[PDB]
DNA sequence: TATAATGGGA
């Protein structure tokens, strides 16, 4: 996305997107849970081991 | 030293890059728009969602009822509408970091307004209020740096603060600006004359619409009050207020004189019929504190305005007769 | 309401 619709990158064909040139890399001591479907936990509350994500 | 404490605290938060400044300002505007589309989907007010999002972000602890039941309704929404919940949460996180990273700018602006009646930290905190209002209606799409919009808001909030709080006796805003205009001119003509001005020449310097009487009266309100605890002499046993008489509290002689007057008038009125006396007490405000006209007194007694006037006039010359013989009321007369 | 402005001072 961009400020004005002309500078907005639109995918010209079906493909796979990769990211490469980062301003900075933020390493956060955390562990990662991929999800499908939907979520009930919302951004910013603390959780205990076993709580449903 | 609380100033070194606060400068160190805002020192921990690093400044933000132009990319981060655009990204935070973006998430703020996205979150604010996500809130409005939640007021359409759910149907409740903006400020309600605003505070429920602020709660669940900046702090854990009606808290168990209203706050959690509103968040619970928001959590029980479709996936396509729960996006705007997450967008609002991180948008409110962006507002926090946008403020924290620019607290360093508030100090750089507030330090110029010192010595005007508000301390440094009071100059920083009202300035921080301008930083919050600057963020809340900042639109990054104009491609202006955040420092330009903030600086205008930091100065608005500090100037407004000095106008409202610095004076002990509150003064309107334009008068404060007026007093500042007057106070700046007397210092450069002091340097030019080597001496302080008279009211005529400072009025001639102020321009049109200013005369020697107006500068005297506006400077009259400009001065702050004196402290009653101002020490008098090298001796540590006397303040200013120790020598000021009480102009409002009655003296023992005054307090007795008003009581003797109320007693001697009662004894005087007792020489009349009770209607004659009641008419006079109603006409003069001795009953409730207001002079009743002839209509109300006639309504009280069920007679005409003229009948009351005759009662009033006859009661007076009876009082004058008794007064010419006793002379009790001749004094009290100043 | 918008150039940009980002750690005090005795």
From Swiss-Prot, chain A:
Family: Belongs to the RNA polymerase beta' chain family.
Subunit composition and interactions: The RNAP catalytic core consists of 2 alpha, 1 beta, 1 beta' and 1 omega subunit. When a sigma factor is associated with the core the holoenzyme is formed, which can initiate transcription.
Task performed by this protein: DNA-dependent RNA polymerase catalyzes the transcription of DNA into RNA using the four ribonucleoside triphosphates as substrates.
Protein's recorded name: DNA-directed RNA polymerase subunit beta'
Originating species: Thermus aquaticus
Gene: rpoC
Stretch of the intact protein here: 369 to 421 of 1524
From Swiss-Prot, chain B:
Sigma-70 factor domain-2: annotated segments: 98-168
UniProtKB keywords: Cytoplasm, DNA-binding, Sigma factor, Transcription, Transcription regulation
Cellular compartment(s): Cytoplasm
Region (Sigma-70 factor domain-3): 177-255
GO CC annotation terms, alphabetical: cytoplasm
Record function comment: Sigma factors are initiation factors that promote the attachment of RNA polymerase to specific initiation sites and are then released. This sigma factor is the primary sigma factor during exponential growth.
Name by which UniProt lists this protein: RNA polymerase sigma factor SigA
Record organism: Thermus aquaticus
Lineage per the UniProt record: Bacteria, Thermotogati, Deinococcota, Deinococci, Thermales
Residues of the full protein shown: 94 to 438 of 438
């Amino acid at each position: 996305a961009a400020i004005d619709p002309e500078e907005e990158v639109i995918a010209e064909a079906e493909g796979v997107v990769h990211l490469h040139e980062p301003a900075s890399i933020l390493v956060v001591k955390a562990r990662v849970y991929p999800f499908e479907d939907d979520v009930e936990v919302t951004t910013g509350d603390r959780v205990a081991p076993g709580d449903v994500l | 030293d609380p100033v070194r404490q606060y400068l160190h605290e805002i020192g921990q938060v690093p400044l933000l890059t132009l990319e981060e400044e655009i990204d935070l300002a973006r998430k703020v505007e996205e979150g604010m728009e996500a809130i409005k589309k939640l007021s359409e989907a759910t149907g409740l007010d903006q400020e309600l969602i605003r505070e429920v999002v602020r709660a669940k972000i900046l702090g854990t602890a009606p808290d168990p009822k209203t706050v959690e039941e509103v968040d619970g309704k928001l959590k029980s929404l479709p996936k396509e509408l729960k996006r705007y919940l997450h967008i609002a949460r991180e948008g409110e996180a962006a507002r926090q970091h946008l403020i924290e990273a620019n607290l360093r700018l508030v100090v750089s602006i507030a330090k110029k307004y010192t010595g005007r009646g508000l301390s440094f930290l009071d100059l920083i905190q009202e300035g921080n209020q301008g930083l919050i209002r600057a963020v809340e209606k900042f639109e990054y799409k104009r491609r202006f740096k955040f420092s330009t919009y903030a600086t205008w808001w930091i100065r608005q909030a500090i100037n407004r603060a000095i106008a409202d709080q610095a004076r002990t006796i509150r003064i309107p805003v334009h008068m404060v600006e007026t007093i500042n205009k007057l106070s700046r001119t007397a210092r450069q003509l002091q340097q030019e004359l080597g001496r302080e001005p008279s009211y005529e020449e400072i009025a001639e310097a102020m321009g049109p619409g200013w005369d020697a009487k107006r500068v005297e009266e506006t400077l009259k309100i400009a001065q702050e009050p004196v402290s009653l605890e101002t020490p008098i002499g090298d001796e540590k046993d006397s303040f200013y207020g120790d020598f000021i008489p009480d102009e409002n509290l009655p003296s023992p002689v005054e307090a007795a004189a008003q009581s003797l007057l109320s007693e001697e008038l009662e004894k005087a009125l007792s020489k009349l019929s009770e209607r004659e006396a009641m008419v006079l007490k109603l006409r003069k405000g001795l009953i409730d504190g207001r002079e009743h006209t002839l209509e109300e007194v006639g309504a009280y007694f069920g007679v005409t305005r003229e009948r009351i006037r005759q009662i009033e006039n006859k009661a007076l010359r009876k009082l004058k007769y008794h007064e010419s013989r006793t002379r009790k009321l001749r004094d009290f007369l100043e």
